[PDB]
Amino acid sequence: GIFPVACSDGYGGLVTTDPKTADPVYGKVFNPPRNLLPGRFTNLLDVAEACPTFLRFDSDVPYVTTKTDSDRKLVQFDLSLAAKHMSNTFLAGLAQYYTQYSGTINLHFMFTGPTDAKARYMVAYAPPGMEPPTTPEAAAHCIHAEWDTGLNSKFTFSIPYLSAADYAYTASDVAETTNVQGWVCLFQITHGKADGDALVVLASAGKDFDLRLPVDARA
Amino acid sequence: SGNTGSIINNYYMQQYQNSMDTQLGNDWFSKLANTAFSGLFGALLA
Amino acid sequence: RILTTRNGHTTSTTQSSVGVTYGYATAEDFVSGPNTSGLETRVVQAERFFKTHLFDWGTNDSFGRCHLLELPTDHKGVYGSLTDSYAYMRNGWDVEVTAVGNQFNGGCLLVAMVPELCSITKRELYQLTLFPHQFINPRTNMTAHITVPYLGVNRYDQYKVHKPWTLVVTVVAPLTVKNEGAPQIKVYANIAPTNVYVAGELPSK
Amino acid sequence: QTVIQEPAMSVSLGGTVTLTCGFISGSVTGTNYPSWFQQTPGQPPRLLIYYANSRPTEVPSRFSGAISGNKAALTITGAQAEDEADYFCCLYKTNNNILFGGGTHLTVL
Amino acid sequence: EEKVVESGGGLVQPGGSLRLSCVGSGFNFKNYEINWVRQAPGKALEWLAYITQTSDFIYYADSVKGRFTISRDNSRNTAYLQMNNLRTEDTARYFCTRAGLTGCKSRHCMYVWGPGAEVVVSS
Amino acid sequence: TTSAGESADPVTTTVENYGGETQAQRRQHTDVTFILDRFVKVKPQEEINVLDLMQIPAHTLVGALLRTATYYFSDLELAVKHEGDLTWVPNGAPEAALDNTTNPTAYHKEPLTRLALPYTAPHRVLATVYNGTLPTSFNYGAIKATRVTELLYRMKRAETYCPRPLLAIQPSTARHKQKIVAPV
């Protein structure tokens, strides 16, 4: 009369990250109300979009400094989320726990010089396949944006997702000497009396930024 | 509800399986992200 | 960009405002919880501005120079009287940090409202923008205005043994004076409690 | 060193005197944050002027600070008998280099 | 009354080490920056060391960089100046100064001064 | 796109600024409830283990992502390897109660013991940081056995508030290099 079952082999072992739920032992517990608590966030990428975070540059500062030299390259950093320049951003903190990403990454440049310190900057994205540009003249052939400093002190540029595959690795491999996602180059086209002024750079996620394949590889 | 992956209703009642939530008397950062300013500010540059 | 704020019978007008940053909420949640048994009362006499001196920003201050202020600080007024005469209290904050220098100065300050903060490292400062914040940039503004609600583990708390909020001012870019800038900028704070509720009146000293 | 002060100055009682503080090569500006201290023998120095023009509440109104002629200046007007002491000049020049003057000995006749 | 007192001085053979202790009373030691200066007998003041509120920024004069070490303990309301490899040039009266005043929240204030501790380095 | 920058108003731009097209987003793997719903190993004490979610090491995925929230709420799940009988006690109860088997006691199963414990704290939410060392009431209770060898936590119905900084490994080189899995 008993309904017969077959205890299959290889099934039923404890797997972490498995969709099943455990059996209760303690019922009829009511929690204190949590209705309309401030600060609720349900998706970490919503926080990544809403809150830009500073990049890191030489000598641990969140800004680049105006250069008067012939070399107008302010900074040149790999597009990887494992880059040293992005190692202090919320976006990299998320990306370290995921295997793959895909989407636009937004950079925000805020000018903090005096009101009489006008400057003109260019930001360019160099895709993989060639040495990164050393001069703004060569970088003018890439996807780039130029901007002045004026009443509006912040300018936002969207680094696009350009890859052969649909998703790109968040972590870099030891054998890959050159970055597989290219480089972001920030130049200074010109400046007025803006010697020693700071351009503060922040990073955030774009509309189509996605992280996938969670992984725990220490931190 | 994450990591559910089951189409069969739970054997135990929700009263025992989970602690019940009480109401009194929302997603803030989704609201921030959705109301973010996009597009150009003034005229067109290039 | 003229903005005038009015708390109680106190007013504060600024002509270089970049708007008000509401943090974590635009309104207040429920104040009549089951933990007070309906004995809470509102004290509108305490919703006033009080002035404190944060620090003095100079060319000496490099990046990472961080100053903290736990908001339920020493208040010589109605608010401090409530703290000393009531067991449980609840309020949000309306903070106006002013760094009045000159439009010929450079650099940048970040003013943030961090819940449950006692100390912060330099690396974490890079993500200080995760909190309700504004930038004070002398080329464009000299006042940061942030409004935050009550926010804690409990609906009411004992402010003698817990400080829910911390006002944080950090130097993002060093101050530059050059020739026509102000030699130093005295950073002050003008803070107003909002929606003050008290419960459990204490005996006299 | 590199900070020049007058080695000694004399002022009549109730008179006006100006102690001066310069660099050997350069101009003293507000970015140097000049400070003026007063010291009597066997006593720690006490602050008279900070930020080159500001004085504490307890310091009398006789002492005034200014930046004139590319040099920091401490003016004592209506000097009393208590103003005879060594006056020192603190100047800021980079984070790890805080300079002090030689010290001017002011005597009241 | 806001005051600071220095202790730990005396006569020490050159090449030795000793630690000055600064104890402050009448104020919240956590909220103020600490300077260590010294004055040679008959000479002018010389600034030696500077430490911030949470010991995050520390600066030394080039003459005593590496030789000296400044630290603080806010729970004990104390500051410490450990001097190593002392030379005969270091014989002076050492002052612990609290940088801070009503309307002066920077390091260029140097308002509160202690009586100073004498250090005599000779052989 | 130019804006004020001083305000915290989000300014997110897209590639259509220079002729591109924004693609679809698939963000189910960064959902708070989904990502925190997985077992994480914690260091077990010999006999008595107070169930505090801060016992999760900060370098693990679950620990780090939990520490990104100032306040959190969740039900708890345990996977425990133990000898003898495992007794669980809600918070606010004396440790002596861990010797009484009328409290929820799991008899030795064979490989492990999986339990679903509710949120028993007297607070509406628990905090990862407290500006009062957290208060002793920030716990899910305690468990006791003859010897606990393996202990795993799993947050259920996790809710998070007030995001906090989340730091990655800071490399000394141009970028952080790792030995990524690849066929040999």
Author numbering:
A (entry chain 3): 1 to 219
B (entry chain 4): 15 to 39, 65 to 85
C (entry chain 2): 13 to 217
D (entry chain L): 1 to 109
E (entry chain H): 1 to 123
F (entry chain 1): 1 to 132, 158 to 209
Paper text:
Foot-and-mouth disease virus (FMDV) is a member of the Picornaviridae family, and a highly pathogenic virus that affects pigs, cattle, sheep and other cloven-hoofed animals. Next, we focused on the cross-serotype antigen structure and determined the structures of pOA-2 single-chain fragment variable (scFv) in complex with O/18074 (FMDV-O18-POA2) and A/WH/CHA/09 (FMDV-AWH-POA2), respectively. The cryo-EM micrographs indicated that scFv attached to the locations around the three-fold axis on FMDV capsids, and total 60 copies scFv were bound to each particle. Thus, bnAb pOA-2 employed a dual mechanism via blocking virus attachment to cells and destabilization of viral particle, to perform cross-serotype FMDV neutralization.
The final resolution of the cryo-EM reconstruction was estimated by the FSC 0.143 cutoff to be 2.44 Å for the FMDV-O18-POA2 complex and 2.52 Å for the FMDV-AWH-POA2 complex. The pOA-2 interacts with FMDV-O18 VP2 and VP3 in two protomers by its heavy and light chains together (VH and VL), creating a buried surface area of 1008.1 Å2 on the three-fold axis, as calculated by PISA. The antibody VH and VL mediate equal contact area with complex FMDV-O18-POA2, and make 16 hydrogen bonds and 5 salt bridges at the interface. On one protomer, residues in VP2 βB (O18-VP2H65, O18-VP2L66, O18-VP2F67, O18-VP2D68 and O18-VP2G70), B-C loop (O18-VP2T71, O18-VP2N72 and O18-VP2F75), βC (O18-VP2R77), H-I loop (O18-VP2P195 and O18-VP2Q196) and βI (O18-VP2K198) interact with residues in the six CDRs of pOA-2, ordinal HCDR3 (VHK105, VHR107 and VHG103), LCDR2 (VLY51), LCDR1 (VLY33), LCDR3 (VLY92 and VLN95), HCDR1 (VHE33) and HCDR2 (VHQ53). Meanwhile, residues in the VP3 B-C loop (O18-VP3T68, O18-VP3D69 and O18-VP3S70) and H-I loop (O18-VP3D195) from another protomer interact with residues in LCDR2 (VLN53), FR3 (VLS54 and VLR55) and FR2 (VLY50) from light chain as well as the HCDR3 (VHT102). Notably, the binding region of pOA-2 on VP2 and VP3 covers two different protomers that cross the interface between neighboring pentamers on FMDV. The side chains of O18-VP2H65 and O18-VP2D68 form hydrogen bond contacts with the VHK105 side chain. Additionally, the O18-VP2D68 side chain also forms hydrogen bond contacts with the VLY51 side chain. Mutations at position 68 on VP2 as well as positions 70 and 195 on VP3 significantly reduced antibody neutralization, indicating the three residues represented the key determinants on serotype O FMDV recognized by pOA-2. In particular, the mutations AWH-VP2D68A and O18-VP2D68A enabled complete escape of antibody-mediated neutralization (VN titer > 250 μg/ml).
